[PDB]
Amino acid sequence: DLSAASHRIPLSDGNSIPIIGLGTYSEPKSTPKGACATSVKVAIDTGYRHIDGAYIYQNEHEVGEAIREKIAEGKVRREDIFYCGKLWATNHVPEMVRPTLERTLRVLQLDYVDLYIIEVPMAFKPGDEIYPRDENGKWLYHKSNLCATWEAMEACKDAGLVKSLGVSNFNRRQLELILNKPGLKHKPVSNQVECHPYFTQPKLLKFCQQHDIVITAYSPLGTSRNPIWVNVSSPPLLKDALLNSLGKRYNKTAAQIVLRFNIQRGVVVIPKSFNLERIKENFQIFDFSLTEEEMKDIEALNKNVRFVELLMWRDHPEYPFHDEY
Ligand SMILES: NC(=O)c1ccc[n+]([C@@H]2O[C@H](COP(=O)([O-])OP(=O)(O)OC[C@H]3O[C@@H](n4cnc5c(N)ncnc54)[C@H](OP(=O)(O)O)[C@@H]3O)[C@@H](O)[C@H]2O)c1
Numbered sequence: 001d002l003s004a005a006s007h008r009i010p011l012s013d014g015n016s017i018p019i020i021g022l023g024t025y026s027e028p029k030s031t032p033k034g035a036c037a038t039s040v041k042v043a044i045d046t047g048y049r050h051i052d053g054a055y056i057y058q059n060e061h062e063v064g065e066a067i068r069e070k071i072a073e074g075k076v077r078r079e080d081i082f083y084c085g086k087l088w089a090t091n092h093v094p095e096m097v098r099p100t101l102e103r104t105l106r107v108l109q110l111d112y113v114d115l116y117i118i119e120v121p122m123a124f125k126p127g128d129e130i131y132p133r134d135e136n137g138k139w140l141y142h143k144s145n146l147c148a149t150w151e152a153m154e155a156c157k158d159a160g161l162v163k164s165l166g167v168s169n170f171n172r173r174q175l176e177l178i179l180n181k182p183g184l185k186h187k188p189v190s191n192q193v194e195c196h197p198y199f200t201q202p203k204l205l206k207f208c209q210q211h212d213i214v215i216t217a218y219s220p221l222g223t224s225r226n227p228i229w230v231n232v233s234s235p236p237l238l239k240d241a242l243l244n245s246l247g248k249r250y251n252k253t254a255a256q257i258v259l260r261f262n263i264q265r266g267v268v269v270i271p272k273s274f275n276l277e278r279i280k281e282n283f284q285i286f287d288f289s290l291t292e293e294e295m296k297d298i299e300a301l302n303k304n305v306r307f308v309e310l311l312m313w314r315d316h317p318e319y320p321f322h323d324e325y
């Protein structure tokens with residue numbers, strides 16, 4: 001079915017998305033300059049055809065540098081590359097959407113993005129600062145209006161600036177808001193959420209499937225486990241007994257096992273790695289498959305505990321993690 005040379009799955013709007021991609025978030029202060037660019041280039045050489053980034057990751061220019069260099073040398077045509085960008089909370093005001101996308105296009109120095117998604121359903125105070133916090137370190141929110149922001153996203157697709165529209169960190173309620181929006185033009189084709197064996201997203205996955213929405217699993221390897229923002233109550237996913245046990249059976253690492261798990265269930269995975277060897281390791285998941293019994297035992301590992309809770313925003317009206325799914 002899926003192979004290293006062909007692993008794109010269809011999107012509801014007629015487009016397709018490579019089932020695996022390279023995540024590009026990396027802690028700014030502790031990341032060498034050019035590391036992201038080198039990684040994207042290595043990923044493209046390894047066979048990746050999907051890159052996931054965000055202006056707020058502060059390396060979107062490196063991502064564009066790498067993509068342009070690979071297109072320039074003839075390694076791939078623009079049409080063979082799939083890039084997903086995101087609209088941060090401080091840019092949800094309708095009039096700000098298009099200018100925000102245009103900036104990303106200018107940073108990448110490309111004509112369009114394959115996918116553009118609302119980064120979080122929560123809106124923050126519009127401005128230069130991506131993390132609005134007053135004197136008391138308190139967070140400066142902003143009234144959200146997903147429907148209105150979505151209409152502005154639709155205009156971007158109508159202008160040909162982006163091929164597919166989607167969302168990230170949206171719960172069932174927030175997804176219905178768009179899906180049932182009066183006079184909806186473009187339905188979201190993807191919802192990027194935390195997904196892995198410890199948080200399988202069983203109910204959100206089935207809901208999305210009912211609406212032909214494809215799920216993209218961010219933090220598919222369980223995150224970098226940075227205590228500054230990651231919930232480490234759960235043990236390291238890649239140290240899991242079953243996952244490592246299964247890895248031995250197929251002579252694959254636990255990481256490869258968890259990635260295969262999600263793609264086999266139709267979930268797009270975007271593992272991040274700026275390490276030459278691990279970039280290629282994560283791509284080696286088409287030369288084997290898991291049995292239904294193993295798939296069930298892996299899914300049974302779900303703990304319903306998120307590595308990415310973002311508790312500091314649990315008070316925001318659009319906080320998505322309060323609801324069951
Ligand atoms: N939309 C959202 O709200 C949201 C939130 C979080 C993340 N994301 C996106 O999702 C991407 C993926 O998630 P993430 O970066 O949080 O996490 P992740 O992909 O789950 O894990 C990354 C961590 O795993 C390491 N790693 C990679 N391959 C490995 C392997 N085979 N064995 C052992 N360790 C390995 C990486 O280190 P090395 O680099 O040294 O290999 C890094 O520390 C992001 O980079 C971003 O593009 C989106």
Ligand SMILES: CC(=O)[C@H]1CC[C@H]2[C@@H]3CCC4=CC(=O)CC[C@]4(C)[C@H]3CC[C@]12C
Pocket residue numbers: 025054086119131228229308
């Ligand atoms: C405020 C703060 O500490 C920052 C540092 C690391 C940041 C996170 C880095 C990863 C990330 C990627 C996204 O696409 C959405 C938001 C998140 C989940 C960021 C939310 C804000 C954080 C938690």
